[PDB]
């Protein structure tokens, strides 16, 4: 049997954490960067997440009505003397353990999407003398490094870097920043034209040759395109193979161009779709002859008429978002609305259920579209 | 009298998951 001992006061510093097989594998890895790390945005408001090197989990506490005692083996300083009163259902004791902790809850971990902390990130418009716009801000604490950014962000390292490259995040004069849409894509176009002007291998582009090919003509005083900017553009519109060279993608850039067209032409006034397809169609900046598809014209506009819409300007609360959405367009296409609500599910489960719960599903023969009340 | 005993609970209630604040930990 086992002798059970108890301390007069338990230490509440000890806590129980649920360990998934994946989390166990992660725990049992000698070199997983910083192994496992507890991360949080603030001290008194924001939630707390547990991050590995490539994944992010949300913590959930769950209390129970039972008594759970965490006990450990110890070698008793004094020989335990006791008269044996009952032998039934009992073997002779051979060890002594003592309860050092009493837990009343468990910590469940759920797989979740990592997000970036864009609290102290400025906007770059290509403006000269940016340092003054940096130092004269409310937060005297300036985001110096990317490590500092990751440390104060609810995400894993790889997710954080991937999203940082996905949003076209960059750094000027040692300060992290976000490029405006116009400047970012203009930079893209200039990069493309310059790369084709020097007959650069688009499948294997590097930083040095591209940088030299871009700012060779324009004077340095009006040349903001440094190697870091180039690296940002490449990390946004291309994929590296050996990780060291870059290879450009194609559908993402053309669709993004359709978005640029959108911010320019259908922000002020709307116009019937067949007409808009014609005018949109007359726009061909890229040398490469782009193809149209109905899937490409989805998620950046709303309706026999079409109008530009920015996702950032919509309310963040689901019910209100759907309310204003029902105010904006009486009849919706399925594929038009899927990308517009995918990112903001408060339930976080499934896609269709969210749509039917918050709207009126009214399919049709061509496609299973959506309707308003 | 005065022997150590265990107050038995009639049922077992299980709470719903909750968000964790930094203050809840420390």
């Amino acid at each position: 049997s086992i002798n059970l001992h108890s301390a007069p006061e338990y230490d509440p510093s000890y806590k129980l954490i649920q360990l998934t097989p994946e989390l166990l594998d992660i725990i049992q890895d000698p070199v997983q960067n910083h192994q496992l790390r507890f991360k949080s945005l603030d001290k008194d408001k924001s939630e707390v997440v547990l991050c590995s090197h490539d994944k992010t989990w949300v913590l959930k506490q769950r209390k129970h009505s039972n008594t759970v005692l965490l006990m450990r083996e110890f070698v008793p300083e004094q020989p335990i003397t006791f008269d044996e009163t009952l032998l039934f259902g009992l073997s002779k004791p051979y060890m002594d353990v003592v309860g050092f902790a009493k837990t009343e809850s468990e910590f469940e971990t759920r797989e979740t999407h990592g997000e970036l902390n864009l609290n102290s990130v400025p906007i770059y418009n290509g403006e000269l003398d940016f340092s003054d716009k940096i130092m004269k801000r409310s937060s005297t604490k300036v985001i110096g490094t990317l490590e500092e950014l990751l440390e104060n962000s609810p995400c894993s390292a790889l997710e954080g870097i991937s999203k940082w490259h996905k949003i076209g995040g960059s750094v000027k004069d040692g300060v992290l920043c976000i490029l405006s849409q116009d400047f970012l894509f203009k930079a893209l176009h200039v990069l493309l034209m310059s790369a084709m002007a020097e007959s650069l291998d688009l499948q294997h582009l590097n930083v040095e040759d591209t940088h030299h090919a871009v700012g060779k003509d324009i004077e340095d005083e009006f040349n903001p395109y440094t190697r870091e900017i180039i690296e940002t553009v490449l990390n946004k519109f291309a994929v590296q193979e050996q990780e060291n060279t870059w290879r450009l993608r194609i559908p993402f850039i053309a669709q993004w161009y359709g978005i640029q067209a959108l911010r320019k032409y259908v922000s002020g006034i709307s116009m019937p779709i067949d007409e808009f397809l014609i005018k949109w169609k007359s726009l061909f900046p890229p040398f490469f002859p782009c193809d149209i598809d109905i899937d490409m014209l989805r998620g950046y506009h709303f309706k026999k008429t079409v109008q530009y819409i920015a996702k950032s300007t919509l309310p963040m609360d689901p019910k209100e978002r759907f309310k204003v959405l029902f105010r904006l367009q009486s009849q919706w296409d399925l594929e038009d609305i899927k990308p517009l609500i995918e990112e903001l599910n408060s339930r976080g489960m499934k896609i269709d259920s969210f749509i039917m719960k918050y709207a009126r599903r009214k399919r049709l023969g061509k496609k299973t579209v959506v309707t308003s009340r | 009298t005065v022997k150590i005993w265990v107050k038995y609970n009639e049922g077992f209630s299980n709470a719903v998951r909750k968000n964790v604040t930094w203050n809840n930990l420390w």
């Binding site: 499934k350 259920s353 009126r360 023969g365 | -």
Partner: protein, 445 residues
């Protein structure tokens, strides 16, 4: 007179059908071999059929109806349509003395002028419509009586001994003569419907199964004159919905999962409505929205449907106008475009279960191999007020059971049986096994 009213009903049914995505499709003018198919303009999976009356659409011969059959198809592109076949209805006269059939012909030539469309050598008699056929039968029946009475072994009337192939349902007569079967694939052409022997795998209908929960008095049966519907649960293609009447259910129910086996996922979305009429309107609107071509129940013919109909009537709604369902001559609830599959009927006819096993529960245990949620009916009303979550778990459990009972056992069986028997799903479900047999033998002959 009654013609034009049947034409009105026909036109209303046409409107219902078109509202639900079944517009009449008419194929291109003709012009080779059925073997080199696809060279003909048009393809659809046949899911239903009904008798109907159709307009013409030098002499127009004034206004008169055309007998025909509506066939309902699902296309290869996720869409649907309906198409119509016309055919002269017919029946036969037999004579006991062949040599003077011609005199009989002349007699009847004269005698049946007011109803008859044509005749041809048995004597085959064809007609413009079912009503005229029925008038002919009414004219001929007394003769046949006297005739059947007569012991015989010289006048013309007395030479008609009997009629043959006389009680064949018109839709059946057409399904047989044209060799068309539900569950099979056809290309619709001006030459007619062409079976695609290359396609055997079924298409995927939209399937809805539903169960309602209502109040009732203690120790008595539900009465639709005074009791109200408190919830309706249903499933559509594996996705659950539950609608609530908050005049009775004392709180809003939230979304939840009930999945008793991995085979049976049940994610339910909730619609908390303020009162009975709102619940009904949400129900009807959802039905119009999703367009089921099967609706399944358990004892819906005796409970669910008449209750829904009666509450519908009470709130000044016209259910026929709303979703195209109405009671037939047997008191059962039917539509044109959507089959009503009451699983209890299949249970009673084909399941091999004991009266002790005719409950939803025992069928669930027997056929799906698990133990569903159980609740004393007397407790259902008080808990509506007192424990609404448990009631709603029961309701959706009901809908899951009903859905997978239909999908795993009933659907393949009934539809495959339909692939050889010249009937729509409803009738093949409901006819006696003996009548089914009759139909099989008629096919074989």
């Amino acid at each position: 007179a009654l013609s034009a009213q049947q034409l009105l009903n026909a036109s209303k049914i046409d409107d219902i059908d078109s509202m639900m995505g079944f517009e009449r499709y008419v194929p291109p003018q003709y012009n080779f071999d059925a073997k080199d198919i696809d060279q003909i303009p048009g393809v659809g999976w046949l899911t239903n059929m009904h008798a109907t009356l159709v307009s013409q659409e030098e002499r127009v011969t004034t206004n008169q109806g055309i007998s025909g059959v509506d066939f309902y198809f699902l296309d290869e592109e996720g869409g649907s349509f309906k198409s119509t076949v016309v055919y002269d209805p017919y029946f036969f006269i037999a004579c006991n003395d062949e040599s003077r059939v011609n005199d009989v012909e002349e007699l009847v030539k004269k005698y049946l002028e007011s109803c008859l469309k044509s005749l041809q050598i048995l004597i085959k008699l064809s007609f413009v419509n079912s009503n005229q056929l029925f008038e002919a039968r009414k004219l001929l029946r007394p003769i046949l009586q006297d005739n059947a009475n007569n012991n015989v072994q010289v006048d013309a009337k007395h030479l008609i001994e009997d009629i043959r192939e006389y009680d064949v349902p018109y839709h059946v007569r057409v399904s047989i003569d044209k060799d068309i079967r539900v569950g099979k694939w056809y290309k619709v052409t001006q030459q007619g419907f062409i079976e695609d022997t290359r396609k055997i795998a079924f298409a995927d209908p939209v399937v809805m199964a539903f169960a309602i929960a209502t109040t009732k008095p203690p120790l008595k049966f539900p009465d639709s004159a005074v009791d109200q519907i408190m919830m309706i649960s249903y499933m559509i293609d594996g996705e659950g919905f539950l609608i609530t009447n908050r005049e009775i259910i004392s709180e809003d129910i939230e979304d939840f999962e009930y999945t008793p086996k991995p085979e049976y996922p049940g994610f339910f979305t909730i619609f908390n409505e303020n009162d009975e009429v709102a619940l009904l309107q949400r129900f009807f609107e959802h039905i119009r929205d999703v367009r089921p071509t099967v609706i399944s129940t358990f004892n819906g013919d005796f409970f669910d449907w008449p209750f829904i109909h009666n509450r519908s009537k009470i709130h000044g709604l016209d259910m026929f106008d709303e979703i195209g369902f109405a009671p037939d001559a047997e008191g059962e609830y039917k539509s044109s475009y959507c089959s009503h599959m009451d699983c209890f009927r299949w249970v009673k006819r084909d399941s091999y279960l004991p009266q002790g096993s005719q409950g939803l529960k025992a069928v669930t245990q027997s056929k799906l191999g698990y133990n569903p949620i159980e609740l004393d009916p007397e407790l259902m009303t008080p808990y509506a007020f007192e424990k609404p979550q448990h009631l709603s778990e029961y309701s959706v459990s009901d809908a899951v059971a009903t859905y997978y009972l239909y999908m795993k056992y009933v659907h393949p069986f009934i539809f495959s049986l339909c692939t050889i028997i010249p009937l729509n799903p409803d009738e093949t479900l409901r006819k006696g096994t003996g009548t089914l047999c009759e139909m099989l033998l008629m096919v074989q002959a």
